[PDB]
Each structure stands twice: as C-alpha cells, then as structure tokens.
C-alpha cells in the first residue's frame, strides 16, 4: 500500500542489516513447524519430522532464500507490488492453490523472526511499518484469487 516516509525509513534501515542467506530459511522453517499443514506443499523436501530436522534441512534453507529474494524485490517496489508479484501469484494461486491465509501467516512469521533477531531495535512503530509491508505482499501474491 502506501508507507509514510518514516515507515519506509524504518523498513529499509532494518532490512539493510538482514542476513538474506539465513532469514528466509528461518521464516520458511518456522512456518512449517508452527503451521504444520504447510508441509503439504513440501513433500519432496525430505526430512521434516522434527523442528531440528526442518530447520537444518538444506532444501528448506535454499527455498527460504528464494522466498526472501521475492520479499526484497517487493521492498524495492512498494508502490507496484501487484506487478512485482504477478508471476508468483499465478504460481501460488493458479498452479499450487495455496490458500492466501498462508501468505499472511508467513508474513507474520517473518515479523516474529525479525523481532527475534533485532530485539529492542524492532520497536512497535518499526513492526507497524513491517506489518504494512507483509500485508501488501500477501495481498499482491493473492491477486489471482481476487
């Protein structure tokens, strides 16, 4: 949607400190652990039997990195999230049929991961800015449903 300059400031400053090789795997991993029906979409991924197995599964890590790549792209195109996520929308909606509530769930997991990694720095206004971002990404990813 429309972030204020203060919110854009909050988002971009934090994001520059994010380890993009790790945070994606961490968020995808927690998604599969916390909301286990999501493992349904990852049957080829091998061992997902325990939280430790999920988090250390190299395919989970690799795929989380790709997923976070798309978030980063969204961050650079906040005023055109629909266009940025058009092909991913077709993929997640028309091909995979993932219910869009799971997009909201992953966004909130990402928020929890950022909170966990950044602690006090992840202030309530910073979180509010991120909640606008993940809401916008989930909405754009679900466009093929609307």
């Amino acid at each position: 949607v429309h972030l204020t300059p203060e919110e854009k400031s909050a988002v971009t400053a934090l994001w520059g400190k994010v380890n993009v090789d790790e945070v994606g795997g961490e968020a995808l991993g927690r998604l599969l652990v916390v909301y286990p029906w999501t493992q349904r979409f990852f049957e080829s991924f091998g061992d997902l039997s325990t939280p430790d197995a999920v988090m250390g599964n190299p395919k989970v890590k690799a795929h989380g990195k790709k997923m976070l790549g798309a978030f980063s792209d969204g961050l650079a195109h906040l005023d055109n999230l629909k266009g940025t996520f058009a092909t991913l929308s077709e993929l997640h909606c028309d091909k995979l049929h993932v219910d869009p509530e799971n997009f909201r769930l992953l966004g909130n997991v990402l928020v929890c991961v950022l909170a966990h990694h950044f602690g006090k720095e992840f202030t309530p206004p910073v979180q509010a800015a991120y909640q606008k971002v993940v809401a916008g990404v989930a909405n754009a990813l679900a466009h093929k449903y609307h």
Partner: protein, 141 residues
C-alpha cells in the same frame, strides 16, 4: 490440544519473562494498536499514546489473565470463563482480533527472549495463545 512438551515450553517462557510480564503485556497492546489500527475502536475511552498509564495498567491485566491460564492449563475453559463472558457479551470483540493480539504477544516475547524463542517454543506459544483465544471466543450467543 497442548502436549506435555507444549506445557513445559510455555511454562519455561513464562519463567524467563518473570516480573516483566505486565510490562510486556502493555507492549503487546501498543504493538497491536499501531500495527492493527481497527483494534483501537474497542478502547475509545483510553489514551493510547506511548507511555499511557491506562495501557500500562491494562497490559498488567492481560498478563495476569494469561498467567492464570498457564497456571490452570488443563482447564482453561473454567479459568477464563468470566473473561470470555466479558469479551463476547459485553465488549462484543470480533474473533479476528484475538489472532492480532496473539501475534503481537508472540512478537513481544520474541523481541525479549532471544534464547527461549526457538522454533519449538514459538510453536508451543502459538498453540497456547490459540487455545486462550478459542476459550475467549467460545461464548458468543
């Protein structure tokens, strides 16, 4: 359905939080108000600005309810009965709103518990807060 591991996980998290519980409750409330502005309409008579004495006081109430739930985890419907009556009958709180506060409570814990907020404990805490929310939305009529 909380497993034995879930109860141990939730108890451990409560333990580390310690006497910060009320302060953390207020922070979760503030996070909800800023991230999810629709929730603000349930508190038209509160000042919701940062540092508000009313939000601090309410955070303590919220924390006390959650710890009462932890202490009586095998009979949450009984422990939270009066609170579920209040939120449904008198306040008419939209059930969607429980997921929003529950998320903010998790974010607050995560921002304050670096060692404890593992994926397993995260899962256990989400189930606990979902269980509390199920009871709190169980009394609409």
């Amino acid at each position: 359905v909380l497993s034995p591991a879930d109860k141990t996980n939730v108890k451990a998290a409560w333990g580390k939080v310690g006497a910060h519980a009320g302060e953390y409750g207020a922070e979760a409330l503030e996070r909800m108000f800023l991230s999810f502005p629709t929730t603000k309409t349930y508190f038209p008579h509160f000042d919701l600005s940062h540092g508000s004495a009313q939000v601090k006081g309410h955070g303590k109430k919220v924390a006390d309810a959650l710890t009462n739930a932890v202490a009586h985890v095998d009979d949450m419907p009984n422990a939270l009965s009066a609170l579920s009556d209040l939120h449904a009958h008198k306040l008419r709180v939209d059930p969607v709103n429980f997921k929003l506060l529950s998320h903010c409570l998790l974010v607050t814990l995560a921002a304050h518990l670096p060692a404890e907020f593992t994926p397993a404990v995260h899962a256990s805490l989400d189930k606990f807060l979902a269980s509390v929310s199920t009871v709190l939305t169980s009394k609409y009529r």
